[PDB]
């Protein structure tokens, strides 16, 4: 009874997340296809994505439970096909701002993806269901990265054709969302629900901040003329680590009633220690290994957080809880990015940035490590 919704949802996730053109977005926009200068891309186009994402995260989490999750998944599919038909056939800055608006709509609707399944599956299959859907997305992303790299390098394929392949993938993903079965008809009071949400908000803010400066750190540590290939390979390998880590959460048999905190504390230290390893160490290989541990360790916890939050929800407010925690994550990221990186703030270089990122995650582990009063 739990097989059909899981299968179709995981097919939709895999096909939607498999987009080869993602790693080659900046080269595509500034390349000979559009010629959007670096200043334009970095100042008038990309920032629009954050604000559209933040604004559209409000209706999504306010109205994803009332209208059942399917409607939102279908809207996400339609938004995907327009982000990419406008990236394929869009020229100008205004058109790219509109594409960033539609991509903010796309990414703000992902709450319905992770909230839908618990509304159609029995509670006893919340553990297995949680792992599969998270893993299929990471496996899809790594597959897309590898395919794009091989095609560009070993076959000489222009970025336009990577965009065409991603468009086909997202269209095939949308074609599946029309078959998902339709479900049938202040919750933070619980400590377990609330405290897994506190990690979600703060930890997710730090994660998305690191991802934008890992590669710059590698350039600073080991300046090389072939760093581009090594940069891509490590990113794809790091994601595959998350896929196996998230998949193992829903496969290995363990009692999560008493191991809920222990995993949070134990694996919250690993995320701080790994970041301290990237910044401090001079070896570039150990810096590659630190990134794997950091990404895979985090993807392990986001699977338990979603599984454990949904277990303790008395009401069927899955999109509300998931959508408020991802909204506050953007709030922390946006405010904390201005303080640290933006010239208006501190203007820290990449050399010392990861001591703040590693120290930021150290506090998060500190709060949970200190939850012992005797």
């Amino acid at each position, epitope marked *: 009874s739990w097989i059909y919704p899981t299968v179709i949802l995981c097919l939709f996730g895999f096909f939607s997340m498999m987009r080869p053109s993602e790693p080659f977005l900046i080269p595509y926009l*500034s390349g000979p296809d559009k010629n959007l200068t*670096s200043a334009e891309i970095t100042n008038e186009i990309f920032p629009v994505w954050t604000y559209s994402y933040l604004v559209l995260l409000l209706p999504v989490f306010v109205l994803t439970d009332y209208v059942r999750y399917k409607p939102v998944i279908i809207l996400q599919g339609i938004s995907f096909i327009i982000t990419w038909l406008l990236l394929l056939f869009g020229q100008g800055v205004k058109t790219m701002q509109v594409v960033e608006f539609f991509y903010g709509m796309v990414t703000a609707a992902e709450v319905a993806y992770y909230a839908y399944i618990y509304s159609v599956v029995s509670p006893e299959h919340y553990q297995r269901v949680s792992g599969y859907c998270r893993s299929v997305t990471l496996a899809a992303y790594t597959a897309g990265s590898v395919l794009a790299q091989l095609l560009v390098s070993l076959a000489n394929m222009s970025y336009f054709y990577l965009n065409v392949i991603s468009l086909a993938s997202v269209s095939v993903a949308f074609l599946f969302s029309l078959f998902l079965p339709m479900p049938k008809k202040e919750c933070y009071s619980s400590k377990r629900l609330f405290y897994w949400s506190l990690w979600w908000a703060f930890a997710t803010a730090g994660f998305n901040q690191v991802l934008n400066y890992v590669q710059i750190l590698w350039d600073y540590k080991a300046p090389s003329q072939d760093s581009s290939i090594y940069n891509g390979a490590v990113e794809a390998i790091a994601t595959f680590g998350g896929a196996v880590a998230a998949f193992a959460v829903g496969y290995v048999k363990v009692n999560w009633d008493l191991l809920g905190e222990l995993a949070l504390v134990v694996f919250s230290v690993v995320n701080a220690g790994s970041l301290f390893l990237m910044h401090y160490t001079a070896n570039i290989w150990a810096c590659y290994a630190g990134y794997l541990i950091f990404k895979s360790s985090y993807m392990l916890l986001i699977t338990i957080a979603v599984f454990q939050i949904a277990v303790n929800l008395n009401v069927e407010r899955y999109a509300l809880v998931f959508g408020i925690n991802t909204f506050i994550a953007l709030v922390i990221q946006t405010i904390m990015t201005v303080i640290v990186v933006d010239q208006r703030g501190l*203007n820290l270089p990449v050399s010392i940035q990861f001591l703040v990122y590693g120290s930021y995650f150290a506090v998060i582990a500190g709060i949970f490590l200190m939850r012992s009063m005797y």
Partner: nanobody
Amino acid sequence: QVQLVESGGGLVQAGDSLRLSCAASGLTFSRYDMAWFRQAPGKEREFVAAITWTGSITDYADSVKGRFTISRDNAKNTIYLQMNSLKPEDTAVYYCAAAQVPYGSTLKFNLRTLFGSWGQGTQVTVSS
């Protein structure tokens, strides 16, 4: 505001050598990719050279390659360009530019749409 002033242009016999300098000020020089452009008398500005912010990559125009070597000095916030075996077609006014975004090379920004904030130019007249 980023200011760039070039220094080194002049009149040199054919086959002599020159070493242009461009002392940048107003930005963290140790993050921005720098480049040299020229504007020959009768054409538009063209790319001549660029050196990544790490200093490990040096892209050159197909014409200059084998005679020009771009150099940078993050200690003095200065960028240089050694011209050797100057041919009569090297006549131009050389401008030094800076990437509009700090880590242009790392993010794979196209080089031909990355440099702005031009300088004031310096006349190089290589005569036969």
